[model samples]
Target chain A: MISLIAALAVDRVIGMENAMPWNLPADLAWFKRNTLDKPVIMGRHTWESIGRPLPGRKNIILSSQPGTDDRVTWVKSVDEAIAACGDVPEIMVIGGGRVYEQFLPKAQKLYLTHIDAEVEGDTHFPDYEPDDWESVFSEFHDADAQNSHSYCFKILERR
Target chain B: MISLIAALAVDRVIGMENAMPWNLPADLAWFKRNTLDKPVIMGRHTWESIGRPLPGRKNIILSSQPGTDDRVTWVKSVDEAIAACGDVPEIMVIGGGRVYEQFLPKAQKLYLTHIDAEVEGDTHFPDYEPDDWESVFSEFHDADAQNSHSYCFKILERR
Candidate 1:
């Protein structure tokens, strides 16, 4: 199964200045729980933001221009990235905007944290209107001392 | 009571090229049903797009410069438009982007039809983060012959 995972503000901003614009430890933990034993597919920029191979998971990373990295598998295209996942049952598309765009159509599942705040960002999540998908799990989280923004966590599956 | 009424796509596009981008008779009837007996406040651009005062409702219109018609009462500012509304129990803010932005902070209710489609539009719904509002009524509609876009009708109130 292929899944796309990301948290986005109401304005659909996913990143700014090559970094996530807001801090939410709750969403971080959520991402870790979902991807711990899975392979995560991302682009060159996302790897640069994280600064290293994600511990405990295979990073099947992509870029138009390939580079050598023994810690991470580098693929030249989306098709190659999927092929590189090999026997992995779950491939997580953890994103920058372009990576999300490329995998959105192929995703069988979507794990989205929808933050209920209008925020500022230079990089926005790519636009999608998934009327064909239905929520399998959803929870609305109010802002708290730990999380500064109100958000809804939703798991969607294609219908 | 001040309220806003509009149909917005998932992309949050409300209009493009000075006219609505989609044709949906279902939403049109929804608008007419809600605003039948209520006074509607709007900016100059919105009135221009509409072309005339809506029948069966008072048009409390606004602009930088005052213009006259017995059919529609024109006011120079938001303040004047509110003043012209007088003793009406409910005032509907029918919009263009600037009009919606001006009234958004003051709105007690929001009657919105959320179209579940990504569309092209030059003008967008003004950004709003309403953690303070709760849905009082919501109904989802599937795309059918009368409407090509799936949509949800939501009535929200400030909490």
Candidate 2:
């Protein structure tokens, strides 16, 4: 199944230029552990932002059209991205805005990390209806680094 | 690779009286688009809440002690869940509060649907830490039937 995992701010902002605005050690470790050894999918922009392939995983990059790299499996559309994932049970969609907008509708499971604070940015995540899904979240992560921020990691399922 | 997703209230509540307190259509559609054909990792209680298997997806229940259904793959621990996922590129973790917590530290990215308002419930999401993650978001989705409550989707990455 194709599932999306991403982090964001109170306003739903994802990036400033091409990289993140701040750092969180605990959250980073969580991401690495979860997405490791899988086909970590991403859009061209997101791939370019990192400037390299993710170690220990097959890197799948999604563009409007096809492209390829050493370990990267490139596809033209979101569907192709899923198709490119083949029969693998866990096709991961890593991303930028356009890519996420395309895949959000069909994702069965979602891991969302939310921060209480807001920030400024150009790209953002998609918004959707609620009744069609079921969700649960962890208790807020409270600490000084999260001073202006009270955040939670939420998981949602299609109902 | 497994990714997580969810929609939540401002206060982190996911349900009340066994039903979702709000609705969000766009988010639901997006989820379906991404998770189709992938193996969904979830707990028995979470599966029970939905009352059935999700159409077009493989449901893999995570429990050290699975009660029934060989159709569901039971893993005693999170590490076992990862191993059970085998080479599948897209393993999704759906949830009950406890299941989410067990896998929290191991998750790599999160797809969050942050609703503008708060709902009262027995469970909640854990807060994010700035030291470990970096988040980005989408534009605010205006009110609609399934998503009368305002919200946005977020993507988090490890630092």
Candidate 3:
């Protein structure tokens, strides 16, 4: 099974200039807690944006050429990355826009944090039909001293 | 002072075919609670959509001609409606897309409920620069037995 995770603003924007537009520590903590010890797959651009392999997770990069890293596994396609997951029941697709577009249809679950503000951005999450999924779990977060924007974490499964 | 209130989906859409696309009792309750005892202004189409004057609040409609109602105050322009609000410290602008667009720039505060799903709609909230407003208060809600979608209520003040 494939699970995808992302934080999007009210405009469905995910990135600006190869970086997340907002400072959301709670959302980052949520991501880390969910994806820890899991095989996490990302597009080449996502890998480049992060600059290195994420700690405490198996990082799989989808790139045309094998990127050498002792901690990372390189693959050329979505299928190859999934296959690399082997016996892992669930692989997490962490993103950049192109990576999300490719796996959105095939992913079994989506962990999304919806932010309430309209942010200016150059990149966006791929649009999906809400009717195709059902909300299995959801948690709401209010904006506080630590978190800049009020957001909701929703776990949606294909129905 | 004028305050604007609205509920928008993740895509910033507020309505479909002259009506709200979702059934959110909490959001409606929030609207009524805040607008009570204040002059609530709305567009002619919004007046038609609601079908009757809301109880406990003064209903002011912006229309070309006298929209016959002894209980409602009918005005032709935004200025007239605000003036009709008289010495009230805060006048509330309830909406339709056009009404929101017209009042958004002038409203001193905004009460916005941000729904967490992209909905199919014909009417949308006007896009605004988030930098122009500072979020002063925010509360999040999850969809349950009564609500159809997860949403958040935010109070924004002009910066």
Candidate 4:
């Protein structure tokens, strides 16, 4: 089955400008390990956030316009992105705002992080219904007491 | 470059109270084919809506509360979600509300399907400034022609 995954704010905020405002080494480490050598899809802004592809994976940038690294393959639509990746074990639905919503319906499973703190930002992810999806796995994290933010992670599958 | 791809009411409404009132098959097929085996990121409410994990792939859910998953992997922070999947090449950021905002900065690519029509719901995907992302791909699936409602598949990348 297919699934989507990404980091989020307490309010589930993904970004403000062109960059992720906060720095969390632990989070980054998790992303690196899970997505290695796989195909990651993203929007132009998300590509800009990292400044380039993270290496060891296929960078599939979805855009109508052209231009990206050799590591990045440019696709024009969600269908094309899937076609470009071509039935791999999975195709990662990387972000911006528009990308996730566009691809949400097609996924059978999802991986998500829920931050306890709230922050302001521009883009936003869409909403999933409990009735539509089944909660198979879940875990939580408490405030660091020292850190400004606290969050948790959970997983869901299509019902 | 990130964008919102959601199935909304004719008014472009994303959710009702807290869940989707409508479910379509074409949309479901689209989501499943794109995200198989990939990690998906999302928010707490989204997780609630999606009550469980799907088989065959990993479910990475984000939440603020501390917990674990029998089927899914739970994480507290966006950072942790990223860390959990960071090592991999690509991941999908599924959502509810705030998660999209949080991922705006971190994602590299975006895949979206623009509904040819709109709907009425409790939530809406954020409107994006054209200058922010460049649409590299576009395909129109006529509403009357196809089994699913009319919609366009778009891919956006950083400009």
Q: Summarize candidate 4's per-residue lDDT along B1-159 as a digit string, tens digits.
A: 223334444543454224332224456677777667677776656665555775455677777876655677888887788788666656787665566667766655666666544444456655556687888987876542113245566677756
Per-model chain B TM-scores are 0.92, 0.85, 0.94, 0.79
Regions of candidate 4 where Cα sits further than 4 Å from its true position: A143-148, B1-159
Instruction: Tell me the whole-model lDDT of each prediction, alpha carbons only.
Output: 0.80, 0.69, 0.81, 0.65
Q: What TM-score would chain A of each candidate receive against the reference chain A?
A: 0.91, 0.86, 0.91, 0.88
Ranking by TM-score: 3, 1, 4, 2
Q: 1 or 2: which has the higher lDDT?
A: 1
Off by over 4 Å in 3: A1-159
**Model 3: per-residue lDDT, tens digit, A71-106?**
789999877888887988788999878888899999
What TM-score does model 2 score on chain A? Answer: 0.86
- For model 2, residues A1-159, the per-residue Cα lDDT tens digits are 777887787677775333443334455666788789788788777776666788887888877765757667787776677777677778777767776788888887777778654556777887757787688656567523212234577778877
Please report the candidate that would top lDDT against the real structure.
3
TM per candidate comes to: 0.49, 0.47, 0.49, 0.47
Residue by residue across A74-98, what tens digits does model 4's lDDT show?
9999888888878688777878678
lDDT of 3 by residue, B64-84 (tens): 878588889998998888898
Colliding residue pairs in candidate 3: none
Tell how far residue A94 is off in model 1, in angstroms: 50
Q: Write the per-residue lDDT of candidate 2 for residues B61-96, one digit (tens) a residue.
A: 887666586566677778777877678876777666
